[PDB]
Design a protein around this ligand. Structure first.
Ligand code: OS
Ligand code: OS
Lengths: 240, 239, 240, 239
DNA sequence: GAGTATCACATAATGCTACACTCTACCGCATTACGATTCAGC
DNA sequence: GCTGAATCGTAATGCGGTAGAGTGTAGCATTATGTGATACTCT
């Protein structure tokens, strides 16, 4: 139950240097004496959780891993839902997770709060990226290269607060300094949303709080710090 | 040496993807509930397993998946783009799969955004003797090894599944044409086509999996698409 | 624990004759002697679960009921989800509940099966009624009057199997004889769906199985009988 | 006389909409767990309560709601259409509410299909001293009873909520104009407007509840709509 | 530098056995609610 | 007639103790379990 923390640390090491590692290098990446690494590695190899890289110095990750993946340990739906319910429970504001498809984010899933003053929206609906905060965050994450493939010629305006390409980018340069994006009625009148980026081993996703700008004025600091905490949790559990 | 235990536990969980309880797990492996308990926690500490809600539940953890994008952050880190383009073109569900025993180890997939889609999880294991990717992966194998990989009555996952001789037959055809087909042999209603990827990194199979309603309609343009993709790829990693 | 079944039966009686009932009439609607009804009614009145209709003969339902409704015993979402999970668990085919809005049904909620060959669709999306089975069922439920307000002039075709107004109605006259509607690719190629009507105290809703026509050919009888059973269950628990 | 128990249980559940356990319930009422148990089942038999999933849970049952569409299948069975039309016209969330004590008993509602909507469950109880429907319902009340309905420091659910004199003031205005308004007095951000429904079936209030972003924009056209609806209705049930 | 075998020590894994917690079940005892009556006002 | 209300001797019925089939968790001896300096092997 405590030699395991060790073997795990080793797993991680081998995932950090997939090309192959000798037990020396392992002994360095973790403050565990050579011999210990020896024995542990042996056990792991025995259970096929690790492979020998030939007579040459090395031990890569084993097939057992793949042998084990089951009924989708890879579906950010069943993988993130827990944390969504968590956040939405903590704030009582509807939340959402969505991917990025060029210029439109895909509402992968959401949770609606049962407040008297609520904000409801579909799931599976393709919506404009530059328009929402989730979008914005998903957008900063992109390269200057693929950026323009999204911001194409002219942005389809949706209100009187929606932004143009000469102000959008302005914002964007900041969501790489703080990491949290914000849309104030820049999609729907009276509706604000606060998002942040989820850098998973599966990819990049958008996690946002969707709310009535009314309450949005009052609660800000707390909500941002929240989304950020949720970010660090999920990131620790499933990031890369 | 306790590791052995932890792992027997792992496997146990894996074999029942829907989830087990300390009780059930401890009955499946010959261990005491308290021991199981300590081990499960010892693993949940590392996201090697997951608690399954307030009611009784335990399943495998995320770390398990995380350590596979890392496992080979090579072939994935370069084939990913090609899979993207090819996934946008045909707009179907693309699958990069390697071979492990009589079943194919799916390294990566991209699901079509279409209404009627077809999914098969990352890693998901399906007998290579019934999926295109599988046939392809078998083709590129020593006439000596490929017989050993079939030392038992082949899987018969469906009705149109193949026999022994029947299989040995196509096994060459696919070597020649370079591609392989699957019509209602893995799952009644599904068809999948695949082409090899002779690379320096090994023998991988690039396949496309789709329903049958859209299969008969256009089988060729698919095969060609796949072949061009294969070419472009092997102009960067071939050997 | 068994005088309660009785008091309940009485509640029901009073809900069947909201204008007011004397204990005689109650004694008839349920095979329980006059005196018993006397006492029980008394207790109920005492807890405000029933009202006296004045010196004149009568006892209506009490305010306590309203005093009790809580956090929405009225939201077919949290009210039907159990039965959805039930059905989808039983068949492994994606299922759905949707309301009727004129000529478009509103996908209120669904459950997706994790089968290799799956059928996925949004939630909140407005889709054509005459096109889907859920629709069809929701449509039979309407009056010849409001019917035309839905079937307006010409139906927006979606494939080569979609029906026209001179064949639709043909079908419709039958979904009032069996109660279960069927759409075979009449919306999306390769996709069939089997629906039935849910006549709740909240209204009419559509409960359907959405599946790949492939499997749909094989499994039919069993699925229909299933949907029908689910129908009777939900109906017993929440119908009117 | 066991009924008393069952009902104390009911109330208990009601007071905690999120759900209780036999344990918790039995602690809230002075009853033994086993007794609670038997009673809970005795009610679940009648959908008067609901099991709340495999983990520990019990909440109120559907029958409770069912017995309200029946409770008064009159005013609902005739006002429903009007509420439909009026709900489609303004495209907002309409509310038919009656009065019970210092709070309004919502008989029916129809939620706007708009993105930013406002819901308040059927029956939901909110102090009439802060919602339009409430003000309206108070207006049509004996100058003798309406004082008794306010025998304590009025609810102060928000910031812009009203005082005693302050309230007694509007209480007449609404009698006159026939309508009543609510600006951030029930819930910061919400506004609601209401008109009475002097009927032979009693005094009901027809209201419309919406955010403030859309309130200031168009307050009048609303009031007028409501008034015409009221008229049409009371041309079929008025007195 | 790879990876491997050895062995004396006490650390660091074990699995008892008890807990807090769901909802459920049994099952004798006297407390409860039952229902043919009689009474009271319309 | 009907409303609904009040007695009152009977045993039936609703009680509530105390035990069970499940979750996951906590403490804590005892002794097996794994540990790591130092010395061995073969590019
Ligand atoms: Os498996
Ligand atoms: Os309440």
């Amino acid at each position: 139950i405590q030699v395991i923390a060790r073997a795990a640390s080793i797993m991680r090491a081998l995932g950090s240097h997939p090309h192959g590692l000798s037990l020396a290098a392992i002994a360095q990446l973790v403050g565990l004496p050579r011999s210990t690494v020896q024995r542990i590695i042996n056990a792991l190899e025995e259970e096929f959780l690790v492979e020998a890289l030939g007579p040459a110095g090395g031990f890569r990750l084993g097939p057992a891993l793949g042998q084990l993946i089951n009924q989708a340990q890879t579906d950010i739906l069943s993988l993130v839902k827990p944390y969504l319910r968590s956040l939405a429970e903590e704030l009582d504001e509807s939340v959402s997770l969505a991917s990025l498809a060029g210029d439109k984010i895909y509402v992968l899933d959401r949770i609606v709060s049962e407040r008297e003053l609520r904000v409801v929206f579909p799931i599976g609906i393709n919506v404009p990226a530059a328009a929402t905060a989730a979008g914005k965050v998903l957008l900063a994450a992109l390269p200057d290269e693929t950026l323009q493939a999204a911001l194409g010629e002219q942005l389809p305006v949706l209100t009187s607060n929606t932004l143009g390409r000469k102000a959008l980018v302005k914002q964007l340069s900041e969501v790489r300094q703080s990491g949290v994006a914000s849309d104030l009625d820049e999609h729907i009148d009276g509706v604000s949303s606060f998002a942040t980026l989820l850098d998973t081993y599966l990819g990049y996703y958008s996690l946002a709080i969707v709310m009535p700008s009314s309450r949005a004025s009052k609660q800000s600091d707390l909500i941002k710090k929240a989304l950020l905490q949720s970010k660090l949790n999920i990131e620790r559990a499933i990031g890369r």
